[PDB]
């Protein structure tokens, strides 16, 4: 492990970082003032894994804008809905939860049961995909429920995005005018409050950034983190998306790679 860790740490550009972990790394660093992007394999497909939940929540918020009170609707949590990863919803088996609280749960803990219950509210993966298309994203696609959506095969586009497509979508949805201001700010706040990314992009980013992010992973080789970076001193935000497949290294080393993406990005912003 020592040499791999050392090579990861020594990598000062994305191509070298990819090589250090013998992986496939997709990164977009997007300057929202200019539209300029820097990165690596920006237009190759990667499994979204849980990073899609950002846009499931956005789908809910968008529908709520035309169905006021949707966010206060209560949804039963049944024993049959519960999955291995259900850290919030497991406490509510046999009772119900508000749609808003399911949205929070699925962003900040990546609760899989919460995501499936929200899929049921909005009309499923097809509804999330229709939301993405209407927002201007022709690339990203939601196709399956949890946990099957975390499968990936090369050439199978189900539940995939590209780093550049997800970066642009984060800009339009979290910063732009796809949602009404109150909705987009609620979504931003959930991303800011995320609890699952402390070892990933956040670990490599300095204190000058307020970070909102959403992580994802699977059991084979995938580890992802997508983030919005607000300068606390003011100025234009940046977006940083990072998708990794690297089966030759450990789960914990995959986080160390994403942390290093953060370090490289911070230096490239300068």
Numbering used by the authors: 20 to 57, 59 to 238, 240 to 291
Give sentences from the paper.
Of particular clinical importance is the widely disseminated class A SBLs, including the mobile, plasmid-encoded extended-spectrum CTX-M and carbapenem-hydrolyzing KPC families (both produced in opportunistic Gram-negative bacteria, such as Klebsiella pneumoniae, Pseudomonas aeruginosa, and Escherichia coli), as well as chromosomally encoded L2 from Stenotrophomonas maltophilia (a lung colonist of cystic fibrosis patients). SBLs hydrolyze antibiotics via formation of a hydrolytically labile acyl enzyme intermediate, while MBL catalysis proceeds without a covalent intermediate. The diazabicyclooctanes (DBOs), including avibactam, relebactam, and others, are a new BLI class with improved activity against a wider range of SBL targets than classic BLI scaffolds. DBOs inhibit SBLs through covalent formation of a carbamyl ester to the active-site serine concomitant with DBO ring opening.
L2 (an SBL) is one of two intrinsic β-lactamases, with L1 (an MBL), which together provide resistance to all β-lactams, making S. maltophilia one of the most extensively drug-resistant pathogens in the clinic and one of the most difficult to treat. For L2 (Kiapp, 2.7 μM), both the second-order carbamylation rate constant (4,000 ± 620 M−1 s−1) and off-rate (0.00055 ± 0.00021 s−1) are relatively high. Relebactam cocomplex structures were obtained after 16-h soaks for CTX-M-15 (1.12 Å, P212121), L2 (1.78 Å, P212121), KPC-2 (1.04 Å, P21212), KPC-3 (1.06 Å, P21212), and KPC-4 (1.04 Å, P21212). For L2, electron density consistent with a single conformation of relebactam (refined at full occupancy) was observed in one of the two molecules in the asymmetric unit (chain B). Consistent with previous observations for other potent L2 inhibitors in this crystal form, we observe a noncovalently bound molecule from the crystallization solution (d-serine) in the chain A active site. In addition, the L2 structure contains two active-site water molecules uniquely observed bridging relebactam and residues Tyr272, Arg244, Lys234, and Gly236. As in CTX-M-15, these movements are not observed in unliganded enzyme or in the avibactam-bound L2 structure. These energetically unfavorable clashes may indicate why relebactam is 30-fold worse than avibactam at inhibiting L2. In the complex with L2, which contains intact (i.e., nondesulfated but ring-opened) relebactam in a single conformation, Lys73 and Ser130 were similarly close to one another. Despite this proximity, Ser130 is ∼3.9 Å away from the N6 nitrogen, and so relebactam appears to still not be primed for recyclization in L2.
